[model samples]
Structure formats: C-alpha cells, structure tokens
Target chain A: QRVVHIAAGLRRTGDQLEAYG
Target chain B: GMTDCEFGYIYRLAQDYLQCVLQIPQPGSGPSKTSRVLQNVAFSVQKEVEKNLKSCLDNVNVVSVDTARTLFNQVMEKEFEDGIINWGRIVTIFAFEGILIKKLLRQQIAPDVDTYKEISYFVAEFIMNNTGEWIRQNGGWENGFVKKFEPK
Candidate 1:
C-alpha cells in the first residue's frame, strides 16, 4: 500500500478557523 | 518522532483551508491577519506540491477527477452503511481529494486564485452534497463522529 502525506496548515482566526489558504 | 494528531485539528485545517482559499465565508468578510497568513501558507504548500507531488501525479495516469470523486463516494457510502463516520479516516480522504483536485486543476490551467477556489469548492461541495445531512443529523461537528487513527 502506498501512503501519501498532506499536512493541513491550521490556525484559529477570531471565532472561526483557517488553514493554509 | 511521531506525534498524535487530533481530528479537530485536521477538520479545522481542512475547513479553514477551504474557507480561506475559496472564500467560503465570502461576500463582505474582509481579510483578517490570519487570512493573510493562511493565504501565504497556502501559496507555500502549492509550491511544494508543484515541486514534489506534481511529478508523482504525472507518473500515474490511471486516475482522473471523476474517477477519484466516485471512489471517494463509494467509501463514504460503505462507511455510512456501517454507521461509522470515522473522522480520522475521512481526513485522509479529504487530503487525497484535496491534492488530487489541485493536480487536476493544475493540469488544465496555471495555478491561480480561480483554481484554488475551484479545488476548495470541489471538496466542500462534495462534503455537503454527500455527507452534509448525515453530519447534521449525527450532531454537527462537535459530536458528529468518533475519531480513530489506525496504526500503519
């Protein structure tokens, strides 16, 4: 099996959330 | 060293990425400091995708956007049938679709804001179309699903 990796850049913004746009 | 990952973090990451790049909460929401940071980070990730994953994607030709979308739906359907919405597993699924959509868009045209939005829209729309009701019925994001990571 092949595994692919993706890192979701995450951050909290105000009361909302955001990630690597 | 390996680190334990949180499903909340993953969900937020994916959600935020979609919101920022695609302007999911758009119309009048002015850019915030975090938005700018996420935009830059997204650019950096795109660069990495260009340098690293692009070639690997090029090497494989068996899968396309439609095929991938179908496969994703199939898995979700089976999981739904089992009454298990394993959150960790879907993070991997999201990541898979995320990268694949990026590559697919890149193949069609130069990477730009439009392409980014399209990728974000694709993932978000798919989630909404396929599992949105299920998520809602299960108790929203806070208590919707169990988070379990399988050892590799």
Candidate 2:
C-alpha cells in the first residue's frame, strides 16, 4: 500500500509550472 | 517542473550533485535548477526509505558499495512489484536509488561517478525491460503525467 508521492510534487509543480523554471 | 525528465534528466541531476561533491574539475557547477516538483518527487520517496529502511541498513556490520547496490536493487524490485507504475512512480524508483547513495555517503563510502552510472543504468534498463511497454501504453510522460497535471 505504499504510495509513490511523486504525484504530490507533480501537482505542486503543475500549479507552479505557471511561471519560473 | 521539467523539460523532459525521462530524457536522461535524472542522470544529469545525479552528475550535478556528484560534481558538487567531488568537484571533478574544481570550483564545480553547484546544483542547477531542474524542477522542484521533480525534487519533491525524489524527496518524498528518499525520505521514506530513510525512515523505513535506514535503521535496517544501519544493521549491516560492514557496508560495501556492492552491498549497498545489491540492497538497493532488492528494495526497488519489491517496491516496483508491489504497486502499479506511473510517471511519478518512475521517479519514485530513482528516489530509492538516491537513498542508497545517501547511505553510502553516510558511511563515507565516497564513491566516484561509476556508482551513479551503474545504478542509473540499472534503473533505465529495469524500466525498459520491465515496464517500458506498459508505460508506453499508459501514454508515456507528456501524454500521461504532464497531461494529467498540466494545470488544466
């Protein structure tokens, strides 16, 4: 039942992918 | 968060870290900005391994580079098998690799670049041999992960 949690970062990044590198 | 992590990006990050650590050419390049999102992706799993298995790894009476690598490969084999794979999940695997490297560093194993190269190659080969087709069927990255999370 271990979750990868990469999705969490991805979601955050997706939002911030709004601007900056 | 990434231009193309799947496109040899992680290896570059690993090399960047080693460059800073070893300063191969002197002065070093420090860490370059890749993607915090990817970093978060890596840190999540790295921290988990640190918590769940670190003490167990600490149990080893003597740690060798090969020992670390073997244990690392074992850990990934189980982790990958236990769950369905995804794009982030792929990075999750690398995060586990990073955990072993950290362990080695803690022990002062002080490896050269080959350690990263060997493990990095292993993960890439592992994916291609094991889940490459499945990932392809799942839309790869842009179509799968980026598409899934691209602020729509």
Candidate 3:
C-alpha cells in the first residue's frame, strides 16, 4: 500500500515534469 | 532544535557536499576519495534535477520547500528497506538531497544562510539517526561508497 502510493506519486510527478518540460 | 553541540561528523559530510556543489575546493583536507565518488553521484542527480525543475520560475510558484521535502522523503523511502540500505541507495538519497538543497538556495526557498545550514543539518541528522551504523560496518566514508557503488 505504501509502496503503491510512493510509486504513484513518483510516476505522476514524473509525467507532469515531462509534460511541463 | 539542533544545538551547536549536536553538529558532528555527519555535518562535516554535509559541509563538504555544499562546497562541492558550489564548485569550491573543500576546505583543508577536502572530502575523502570515497566522498568524491559520492559527490559524483550527487552531481549526476543535480544535473537531472536542474533540467526537470525548469528555469521558468521567475513568477510561478511551481515548487516550494515543502515540495522539496516531499520529493526527498519519497526518494529516501524508495531506497531504505526493512532496516537495510545498499551503498548505491545511500548515495542516491543523499544525491537527491544535495541537489534539492541547491535548488532551494537558488530559488530563495531557504531564504537565508541559517535556513540553509538547518536544511544541511537535517540531511546529516537523517543519516546519523537512520544509517550511520551501516555506513561504518560497510567501510566508512573513506572506502564504503566507492567499493559498493560501482560506476559501471
């Protein structure tokens, strides 16, 4: 559960960084 | 909350790290050869972070001190596992923290030297409390990181 949230946060932010960049 | 007496060896590590990021020669003896390896790992991360965070922050509030903390904690948790941390993992997390600290200072999120030092202390404290023993058992700074984290 915790790992899921962590990965979720990381992936979501990564995607956002990609998109924004 | 950290008194002057509380600053110790980990603080030394943080001090050298900031000097490294600032491109200044480390004062006196400088960081150890293994610490240099650790710095190289951080240098790689800083380059990536500089790109990912973007330079268009003249007006927008895209990131904050809190944002940096969130990212740092996420990376820390990813590396620390079941009371164990790999050499690669330790360097990686410190790498993230190092880069993030620079980011904050550049953006004025830290806003002053005192705040900057406090942030540095926090990183040191994290290691002192969480990973100091393992660091010693492995090889200490002089040989620990370099031996475990193969550049290849």
Candidate 4:
C-alpha cells in the first residue's frame, strides 16, 4: 500500500503539472 | 529540527553533485570528448540517483512515503513557477526527494522491493517523458535556471 500510494502520488502531480517543456 | 551537522552534510551533497557532474567542463564550449565525459557522468548520476533512492526507501512504510510525496509536491510547486519544468528544477526535485526519503530512513522499517520497483519506474517515466523540451529551451546546464529549495 505504501508503494502504491507513492506511485499514485507521482502520477497525480505528474498529471496535473504541464508536460515538461 | 535538523541541527547544524545535518544541514552541513546535506548542503555539501548538493554542492558536490553540482560541482562534479553538472559543472563538468565541456571542452571549449563546443562538441568534444569532454561532452562525452559529461554525458557518461550524467548517465552514471541518473543510475546512482535511482539506486540511492531505492536503497533509501527500501524499508520505508506507506505513511511516510505518502508524506514524502506530499512534501515533494509542496516544494516543487513553490520553486517551479510558470508550470514549465527545467533542468534545475529536476535536480532540485531529486535532491528534495532524497532528503524526504532520508528522513524516513531514520525510522527503520522495511519496504517491499516488488512494489517499490513500480514506484521507482513511475518516477523515471515522468521525468523521461517530460524533460526534453525544458532542457532544450532552457539552454542546458550552464544557463539553466537554478531554483533554491531549502527543505524544512
């Protein structure tokens, strides 16, 4: 569950932020 | 709660990384053998970054991981204005994440490699897919915008 949340959080912010440019 | 000793050690790590890998000379500002050397150093650093990250979080539990992730974003949003990612921000994020995990490392729990591998994969995937243009437009390392992120 710990790893899962970490992955989820990474994706969460990764999605919300503008694509790196 | 970090004492002077702690800050000095962490500050030195960032300073050394910047001096050693990012600031490696590029042979008279043109494409040259030294560029290759820097490239190799970058590749090595990326590998070590992931390796150290994995080792640091190897035993960290879920709650702490969540907090680290939250803190990572908190710092990122504050430093990275305009929503455009840059190389310096990437380095800053890497350093900040390292500090977060190190805080957890002190607690002495155990992490499952299988699950952690996927988490690590996502981190690499996010950076790999997103950072190209940022590096290209930002003019690479010598002129990249460096944001100071002092972790609390």
Maximum-DockQ candidate: 3
lDDT for each residue of candidate 2 in B13-108, tens digit (9 for 90 to 100): 544433333335234554444432345545654565455555454665224567755665555565565555566556556565565555555663
Off by over 4 Å in 4: A1-21, B1-63, B108-110, B113-119, B125-130, B136-152
- Backbone clash pairs in model 2 (N, Cα, C under 3 Å; residues 3+ apart or in different chains), count: 0
lDDT of 3 by residue, B30-140 (tens): 666656676776566456544554433222331456665555565555645445555544554555566666667667543655544555667777777777777777666
lDDT of 4 by residue, B1-152 (tens): 11211333223333333333333332445432322333333344345444544654455543455555554554444444346563434553444444444455454255432322233333343444455455546543333322111111
lDDT of model 3 at position B34: 54
lDDT of 1 by residue, B65-151 (tens): 454455445434543444444333334334444555545544543344444444444555555555556555654443433211111
lDDT (Cα atoms) of all candidates against the true structure: 0.41, 0.50, 0.56, 0.40
Over 4 Å off in model 3, which ranges? A1-21, B1-7, B48-82, B149-152
| Backbone clash numbers for all candidates listed | 1, 0, 0, 2
Task: Name the regions of candidate 1 deviating beyond 4 angstroms.
Answer: A1-21, B1-15, B18-58, B61-84, B101-106, B145-152
> Which candidate would rank higher by lDDT, 1 or 2?
2
lDDT of 3 at B90: 54
Better of 1 and 3 by DockQ: 3
Question: What TM-score should be assigned to candidate 4?
Answer: 0.36
Query: Which candidate ranks first by TM-score, i.e. highest?
Result: 3
TM-score of 2: 0.58
